[PDB]
């Protein structure tokens, strides 16, 4: 509405990158010193990239609780994601352990295992039906039962068991496989589509535990799908929807994981998909 306005100002003015920097100038700044233990060092896929102390996800095994993966607590919105990087080869079993234990339905992941030939994430989810993963070190067992691949997207049925107690629950893992290699998608429709799937699934429902979301940092696209989302939200329940400050609420959003949109090509994205989203609902 107005919003379509300011965007417009924005791109004839040129300043995307001012806005940004802007944003990375003003965001918060919280410790994170159990991610910067010596004992957590090889929990962290990127040194630069680390959960604050007070939102981040605490494992509940008798072992090192440590996971990098934040609690984003969006209030006004009345949603909650957890952001996390793309698991380790030693952190799967970490990563399904906090699907477990925070009662998650969905995980959505939003890069390729491999980029640009560069590995972005492990592969820390059954292929093939027939060559379930165990977990030994946090005693569960994932299984591939069906996927629905599609052009853009696949979601895929895994069911998690607790070896423990043999309790199995179902996870819906919506992968959206068509981020291109460089830069932002040209259209947000195949985005949006997703995250729409995302929330016809009922995996973003309050009545289960925060969606996992994932790329290779946890940052950038992720914060990108996070924040579109809030922002939608947002302006299907606010009196005046064009109230919705894109900025403030990724200030909002920063409070609980640092770095959220890593770019200003990001940034200008995260609009303009609220701006098609808003259309459309
Ligand atoms: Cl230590
Ligand atoms: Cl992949
Ligand atoms: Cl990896
Ligand atoms: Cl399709
Ligand atoms: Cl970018
Ligand atoms: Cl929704
Ligand atoms: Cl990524
Ligand atoms: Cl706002
Ligand atoms: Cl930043």
């Not at 990375?24 to 233990?37: G, I, N, Q, T, W």
């Not at 070190?137 to 591939?144: E, Y």
């Not at 996992?212 to 922002?231: E, K, M, N, P, Y």
Request: proline share 4%; glycine share 4%; with cysteine.
């Amino acid at each position: 509405m107005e919003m379509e306005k300011e965007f417009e100002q924005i791109d004839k003015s040129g300043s995307w990158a001012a806005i940004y920097q802007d944003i990375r100038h003003e965001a918060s700044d919280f410790p994170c010193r159990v991610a910067k233990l010596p004992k957590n060092k090889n929990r962290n896929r990127y040194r630069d990239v680390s959960p604050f102390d007070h939102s981040r996800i605490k494992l509940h095994q008798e072992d090192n609780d440590y996971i990098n993966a934040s609690l984003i607590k969006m209030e006004e919105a009345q949603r909650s994601y957890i952001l996390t990087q793309g698991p380790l080869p030693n952190t799967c079993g970490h990563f399904w352990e906090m699907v477990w234990e925070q009662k998650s339905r969905g995980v959505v992941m939003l890069n390729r295992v491999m980029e640009k030939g560069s590995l972005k994430c492990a592969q820390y989810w059954p292929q093939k039906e027939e060559k379930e993963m165990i977990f030994e070190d946090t005693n569960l067992k994932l299984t591939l039962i069906s996927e629905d691949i599609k052009s853009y997207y696949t979601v895929r049925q895994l069911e998690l068991e607790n070896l423990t107690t043999q309790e199995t629950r179902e996870i819906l893992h919506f992968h959206y496989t068509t981020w291109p290699d460089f830069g932002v998608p040209e259209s947000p429709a195949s985005f949006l589509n997703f995250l729409f799937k995302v929330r016809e699934s009922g995996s973003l429902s309050p009545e289960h535990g925060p969606v996992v979301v994932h790329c290779s940092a946890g940052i950038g696209r992720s914060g990108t799908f996070c924040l579109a989302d809030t922002c939608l939200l947002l302006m299907d329940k606010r009196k005046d929807p064009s109230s919705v400050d894109i900025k403030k609420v990724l200030l909002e959003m920063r409070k609980f994981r640092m770095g959220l949109i890593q770019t200003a090509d990001q940034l200008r994205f995260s609009y303009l998909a609220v701006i098609e989203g808003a259309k459309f609902i």
